Symmetry: C2
Subunit: 242 residues, 2 copies
């Protein structure tokens, strides 16, 4: 069962988590960020800031590429940020938004920002599918972002700062501590998505490999036999997909 | 449960099934076909011709793009066809080879043509995964190409010509009837693959949509409640993925 991210990759991501860009005006850097995000097939979006769903506006929005994290100050820009590129990004078929449990976020964006989130790769729904396909029954609990980062990447339990201070989040200037945290909370989302995608698809890829080998690697006798029994699934196959 | 291909698309494919190109010398048209095939992310390869696995050489090999079917006369060209592009195509990470039950084909290509088939999207392994994820238990029988074409596209039962005449297959000139048949047998492989891919992935895509809607479309009261119970899977979710 054991799945741990490489050191090298960890370090790459940790660098990126410190290299965030904070944007609080519709300016040069805002358009550079919107261009950057629009150049990607996949971007990521954090749930941080929409923990109250429709009850409450977002004070910030965190979006990333693979290579660069962006923190948009929504409290300051308000609808002007959405209307200058962010609503299009979020509502569009492309780019896909990677998210972990986007339920509150969908809710918040629609009713408070007039943004109909669409086209999403949801790592929490991913974990559910992987669990359902493995252990046959789907579980009753879902897994937080932190638990997934632990089970899929081997990161320590409390990497995610799950209780951002509601009052400091609305205070300005926004603290470095909050920012560093928002950046850390999003920074692994890409790689997690890419591990979870792989695990969802593995039973298929492994099944195909089992097919490519099943006859080709047998000795002549068993090869012949197996050609007579093609309507059956290979004996190894149940095994290979688990 | 009901899945039927569109008329329009059927007709497009039926046209293509008549527009095949027969290649029996390493010439201009052979290199044009190898370039064509190398330009694609996905090509298809038929099991026709390798029904005896290692016991017997391939008299022809059928490969296609989306837009063009190719029939390579292996009996005539022998190892010269593989060495001038086909072995690279078949052995490579890319393009992916779409196939239906590639077991005998893997076997035949390795032991008789010295070709290590690799990187495959196997529609039969696809059907198994779809069945396993739907009905929890994987079945004991596999489905032929024809049965899949029936269940996924609604094509009639006997579209596939499953018993090509072994003796006429080795006779030259190769009959038009055989050729028309080889082309017909491969012609739907692309679209089948693309329907089967979709069905394998649908439980995920549907799960994500259920998440995007679950809170956002509730009235205020239920919205609030659901924000308290996030550790649980949405009630609709089991439903949505089936």
């Amino acid at each position: 069962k054991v799945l741990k991210i490489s050191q090298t990759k960890y370090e790459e991501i940790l660098k990126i988590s410190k290299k965030y860009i904070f944007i609080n005006q519709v300016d040069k850097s805002f358009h550079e960020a919107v261009d950057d995000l629009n150049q990607q097939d996949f971007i990521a979006v954090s749930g941080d800031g929409a923990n109250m769903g429709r009850k409450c506006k977002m004070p910030f929005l965190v979006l990333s590429t693979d290579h660069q994290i962006y923190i948009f100050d929504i409290q300051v820009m308000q609808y002007h940020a959405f209307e200058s590129g962010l609503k299009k990004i979020l509502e569009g078929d492309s780019p896909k938004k990677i998210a972990h449990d986007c339920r509150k976020l969908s809710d918040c964006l629609y009713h408070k920002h007039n943004v109909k989130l669409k086209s999403v790769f949801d790592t929490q729904v991913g974990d559910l599918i992987i669990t359902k396909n493995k252990k046959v029954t789907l579980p009753n609990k879902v897994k937080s972002l932190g638990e997934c980062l632990t089970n899929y990447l081997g990161l320590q339990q409390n990497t995610i700062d799950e209780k951002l201070d509601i009052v400091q989040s609305t205070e300005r200037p926004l603290s470095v501590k909050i920012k560093d945290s928002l950046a850390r909370n999003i920074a692994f989302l890409h790689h997690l998505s890419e591990v979870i995608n792989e695990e969802m698809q593995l039973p298929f890829y492994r099944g195909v490999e089992c097919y490519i080998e099943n006859i080709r690697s047998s000795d002549d006798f068993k090869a012949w036999e197996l050609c007579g029994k093609l309507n059956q699934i290979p004996k190894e196959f149940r095994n290979a997909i688990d």
